[PDB]
Amino acid sequence: NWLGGLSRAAFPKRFVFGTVTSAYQVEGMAASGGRGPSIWDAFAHTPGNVAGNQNGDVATDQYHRYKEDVNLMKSLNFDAYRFSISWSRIFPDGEGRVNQEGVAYYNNLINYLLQKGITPYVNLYHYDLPLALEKKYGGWLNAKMADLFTEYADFCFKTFGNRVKHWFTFNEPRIVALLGYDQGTNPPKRCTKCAAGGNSATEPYIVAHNFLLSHAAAVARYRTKYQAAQQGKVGIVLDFNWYEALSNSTEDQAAAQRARDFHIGWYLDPLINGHYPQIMQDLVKDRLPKFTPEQARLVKGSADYIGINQYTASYMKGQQLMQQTPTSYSADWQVTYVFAKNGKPIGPQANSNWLYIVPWGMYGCVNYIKQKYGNPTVVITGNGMDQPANLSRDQYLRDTTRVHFYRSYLTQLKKAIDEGANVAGYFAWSLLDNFEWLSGYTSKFGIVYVDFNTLERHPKASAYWFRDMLKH
Numbered sequence: 067n068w069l070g071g072l073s074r075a076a077f078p079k080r081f082v083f084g085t086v087t088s089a090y091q092v093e094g095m096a097a098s099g100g101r102g103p104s105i106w107d108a109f110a111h112t113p114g115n116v117a118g119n120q121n122g123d124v125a126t127d128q129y130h131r132y133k134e135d136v137n138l139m140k141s142l143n144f145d146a147y148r149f150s151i152s153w154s155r156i157f158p159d160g161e162g163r164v165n166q167e168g169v170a171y172y173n174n175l176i177n178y179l180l181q182k183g184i185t186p187y188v189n190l191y192h193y194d195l196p197l198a199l200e201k202k203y204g205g206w207l208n209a210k211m212a213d214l215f216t217e218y219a220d221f222c223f224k225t226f227g228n229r230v231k232h233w234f235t236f237n238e239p240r241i242v243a244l245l246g247y248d249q250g251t252n253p254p255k256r257c258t259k260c261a262a263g264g265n266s267a268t269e270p271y272i273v274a275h276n277f278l279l280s281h282a283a284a285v286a287r288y289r290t291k292y293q294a295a296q297q298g299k300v301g302i303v304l305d306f307n308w309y310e311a312l313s314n315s316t317e318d319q320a321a322a323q324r325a326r327d328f329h330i331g332w333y334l335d336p337l338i339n340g341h342y343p344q345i346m347q348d349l350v351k352d353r354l355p356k357f358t359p360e361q362a363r364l365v366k367g368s369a370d371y372i373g374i375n376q377y378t379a380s381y382m383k384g385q386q387l388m389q390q391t392p393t394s395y396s397a398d399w400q401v402t403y404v405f406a407k408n409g410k411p412i413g414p415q416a417n418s419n420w421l422y423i424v425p426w427g428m429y430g431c432v433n434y435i436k437q438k439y440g441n442p443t444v445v446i447t448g449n450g451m452d453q454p455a456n457l458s459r460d461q462y463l464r465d466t467t468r469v470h471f472y473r474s475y476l477t478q479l480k481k482a483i484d485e486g487a488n489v490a491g492y493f494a495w496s497l498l499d500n501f502e503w504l505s506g507y508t509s510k511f512g513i514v515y516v517d518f519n520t521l522e523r524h525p526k527a528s529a530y531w532f533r534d535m536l537k538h
């Protein structure tokens with residue numbers, strides 16, 4: 067049967083199923099409703115930065131259509147919705163004056179979700195730093211971000227936390243560090259060779275450190291000021307794609323483990339264990355900032371659950387570890403990526419070149435966190451795949467590859483849960499086709515098709531698959 071034996075009965079009692087969007091990717095009204103610009107508004111409005119010079123000015127216009135979209139997710143039998151608050155929609159300058167119209171939008175959205183029995187899971191940040199903070203403070207290179215983010219978080223807790231009980235601070239800080247400060251392809255476009263300036267060997271580490279310190283400061287504020295009354299939880303969302311040793315050689319096993327540590331351990335060792343991974347300390351040395359004992363104690367245990375965005379897997383080949391002149395966070399890993407073993411590709415690619423369809427990577431990642439980190443509460447906060455541009459409406463709707471994707475990946479997640487992994491929920495990226503960053507509207511991740519000419523929603527086969535799977 068097309069469900070492959072999956073249903074709510076196949077997952078733990080009270081297991082949460084949801085869909086996910088982010089503010090800039092779906093809201094629209096980017097320069098309206100009092101919203102100030104983010105670093106992504108400036109970036110996307112610069113010719114050449116995004117596919118087709120597209121931007122999020124309108125996106126899916128969820129800002130006007132949110133009741134349609136909430137009705138849809140309820141009709142598809144989801145329990146929860148992960149979305150983000152745009153910092154610059156609340157504080158157009160990132161600090162100071164509150165945009166009451168922006169506050170009203172999120173109140174209306176939260177209230178409608180609750181009215182319809184959908185639990186809000188709310189990210190405070192999803193790549194969309196207020197442009198004013200980038201210009202005034204230098205964004206995530208500045209340790210002052212911990213104060214600025216904490217004050218923003220405090221406002222959100224105060225304003226929405228009587229209703230919102232499930233928060234995340236950040237979304238995929240690794241990707242901000244990597245694309246914004248190593249490769250320099252995402253805002254602020256910093257890197258060693260970059261026009262904007264930068265240093266690919268140092269800045270990614272500074273940025274990650276400031277995300278960890280800012281997360282910890284915001285959670286300390288929640289716990290000391292809001293938790294007693296509100297009795298909610300705050301976590302963080304981290305991307306983790308799987309790394310599998312190419313062979314059982316000591317060298318290849320070491321490489322796959324180094325990759326895991328530089329990818330997920332970079333954040334999870336501080337959050338769970340109060341230190342960076344040993345291998346990062348050993349290889350990155352003076353370029354890796356040091357937590358003081360007090361900071362480490364603030365960071366350790368500061369996530370009530372770990373959000374994991376899981377998409378793909380790679381084979382890793384090793385090499386003898388060498389003394390080398392530092393060049394980048396990426397090069398520091400001293401690994402070699404491989405996408406075939408014994409002449410066979412690890413899996414077929416979705417539209418995005420990086421996204422190999424490898425359902426056993428889901429098991430790999432979840433089992434690994436279970437075994438390495440004392441089985442922390444994990445929520446799969448994003449998982450999905452994309453179709454390419456230029457298909458017909460009907461071609462988008464007949465998304466049989468995505469149906470197969472969800473059935474296979476969820477079977478692998480179930481395998482890990484059945485083996486004892488402490489996974490509390492699962493969220494599909496994305497509810498809607500949306501603005502896919504550098505790919506603009508040329509990458510379609512939704513279980514619901516969005517016609518970007520008319521803005522009409524049409525559920526795809528995968529949406530109906532979820533509806534059938536999730537029926538109560």
Ligand SMILES: OC[C@H]1O[C@@H](O[C@H]2[C@H](O)[C@@H](O)[C@H](O[C@H]3[C@H](O)[C@@H](O)[C@H](O[C@H]4[C@H](O)[C@@H](O)[C@H](O[C@H]5[C@H](O)[C@@H](O)[C@H](O)O[C@@H]5CO)O[C@@H]4CO)O[C@@H]3CO)O[C@@H]2CO)[C@H](O)[C@@H](O)[C@@H]1O
Pocket residue numbers: 088237238241244305306307375377378380396403419420448495502503511
């Ligand atoms: O995107 C959908 C949705 O999901 C969330 O976040 C996504 C995010 O949007 C993506 O940008 C991001 O993509 C990264 C991949 O996950 C990751 O595997 C990939 O890793 C690269 C690595 O950075 C690079 O060094 C390496 O290059 C080597 C080549 O492979 C070799 O051929 C060559 O010889 O050597 C070079 C250098 O060693 O390749 C690897 C493998 O691709 O980096 C991607 C960044 O482009 O994934 C996120 C989740 O994983 C997000 O929540 C939503 O907002 C978003 O819309």
Ligand SMILES: [Zn+2]
Pocket residue numbers: 127130
């Ligand atoms: Zn509109």
